[model samples]
Target: GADSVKIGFITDMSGLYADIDGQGGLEAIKMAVADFGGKVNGKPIEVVYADHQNKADIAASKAREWMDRGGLDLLVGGTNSATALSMNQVAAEKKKVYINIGAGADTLTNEQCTPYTVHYAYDTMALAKGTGSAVVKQGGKTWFFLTADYAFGKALEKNTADVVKANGGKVLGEVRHPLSASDFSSFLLQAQSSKAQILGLANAGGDTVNAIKAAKEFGITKTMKLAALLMFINDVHALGLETTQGLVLTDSWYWNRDQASRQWAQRYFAKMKKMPSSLQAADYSSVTTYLKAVQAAGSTDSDKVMAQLKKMKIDDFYAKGYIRTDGSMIHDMYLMEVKKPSESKEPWDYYKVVATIPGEQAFTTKQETRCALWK
Candidate 1:
């Protein structure tokens, strides 16, 4: 109550993958801070940010400045794999909370889990469990993949393999590309020739849109059905109904899914002029939920904050989530199919939820996680 408390989101501010979650998450958190009446327990609350430039080292350096010079209390919102990894170190070394809202790499909560960092929204395990399992159950028995060549992609692919195999499905093969590759033609060709029934996509953000565009151009979608393992609401919206229609994907939040989500979406759209993506929704969840934790604990102490975070129940527009011992933020994941233009009833009404995977069933089990935070 007597100390300044600042919460910041460090992400790729210059860009939004699928035209979402850059400024979107930033704006959403701004709303969160505002909703909290601009302070926590009479301590002035400040929100900060960094561009990240999609580099882990640069992210780490900027986070250091936020901690040392800016007196940041919670360094949150790294948008992808390596950046979240570096932010994890920053939070741990600095003893602050790091809310990973966009990164899909499971290691952030597994081998890399630290007491100060929480994988706050979604992960590879959830995506694979939700989308991959849905696809397999829907008769997509054979699979191939075009994976981003990094921690997120690799983890998503492995998790996909787990879901597919568990359902008695088979993975024909895969191809890996550098993160945020500009082209996916060769990869599409590889997937096409693999003769797999499901061409599972392992890249998200800009790469998700780009690869889908290339698939439409190459007519790969004509012969083999496409499954985006980690695609977001913005990607589907920007790509339009015709392009992404019938495509199956996974996510933690969808703006049109419920009255609570719609309320948040309307609130976010009033300022951002677009529907909130899952990551943006996550940003809202991370900020509002953590603030509640801080209030409950009655202090800025890291130990107290972490304890309260794990113990608290989260029920917001983005999630029915709670921080877990493994550091994975447990939340429901959805299997969604992009709607056709004729199916649309209102603006930003993009996907129809096919199924809801319970948070307990969607993520990797705690016994399987390698986090030493509790051990």
Candidate 2:
């Protein structure tokens, strides 16, 4: 029984990001485990989860307890970048394997990269490449940011600003709010006062939703455009088409995109009563990928599994993707525009794919490598 595989999911279970991944992500992981027969190498596979509560301290402590005392062999989940970075350090210290599913900070794959960690799904650079450049090219050239005060937010703001400037746009100013701030009045007013053509929201989940709602309430949307740099379908659903229509964002996977994805989504919806966000879908894909690596190596040892994972190409229902030496999972990222209410024919019909950004161009390229392991 000592050799039985133990996987831990450290996530924000009931915070601002809850709808973004949360229980849905755990369900996806369970689906992967069930699909894998709930076993690996003839050993029972056990999956456990903890709510990080969007706190780095809570996430780090939980990860340590799970690995040191509970004997977790591999770790997954992180809905916020701060929590993800903290957990990543613990995984590296414990010499266990980690696959990051939700957090989008580029630092995870660059400066903070660990051999034991893999950055799955999407990242800040991909978001910038998808929405940032496209928005700039479309003549929303003067920009301002409403940023979250955290690692992910800073990186997203910086990355998008970089893209805007590169495309001949000007950043007027920005305001930062603590994560999950229910009051975005002052921030929205500040952004509106700047008179920027585009107001970039460098946050995710409820923060983005709250900011957008506050902006609409304050008439910020009348003259300024809102750019939800990193958004999930659930956010769109919450805000509805009337408020979110014409908004542009980026996504890696959508449940309605293809026959393969729709089939998987149908099974997931049967159990959860909701469509899967890219974050939730990535959670499923990462678990399946890890188990397959374990099977191929015939071992759950960190090095062996990671080596196998790097060598494998993933073309599952999630994406046609691959993990690079720097631990970033390379995949096609999509530029999405929210559908107008008149154009949406069914419930949950939220987005229209505007462009498919090739993974090679969307993600950090070889020249952007700050990952020491890349050498």
The candidate that wins on TM-score is 2
TM-score of each: 0.96, 0.98
User: What digit string (tens of lDDT, one per residue) describes model 2 on residues 257-375?
Assistant: 99999999998899999988988889999999999999999998899999999999998999888898889999999998999999998888888999999998988878877788887
Candidate 2's C-alpha lDDT? Answer: 0.91
- Cα RMSD for candidate 2? 1.0
Give me the candidate number with maximum lDDT: 2
State candidate 1's TM-score. 0.96
The positional error of residue 319 in candidate 2, measured at the CA in angstroms, is: 0.8
lDDT of each: 0.84, 0.91
The residue-by-residue lDDT of candidate 1 on 88-167, one tens digit each, is 88788889878888788988878888888888888898888888888899999999989988788898999898899999
Alpha carbon lDDT at 84, candidate 2: 90
Off by over 4 Å in 2: 1-3
RMSD of 1: 1.7
| Cand. 1 Cα-lDDT | 0.84
Q: Point out the worst 10-residue segment of candidate 1 by lDDT.
A: 14-23
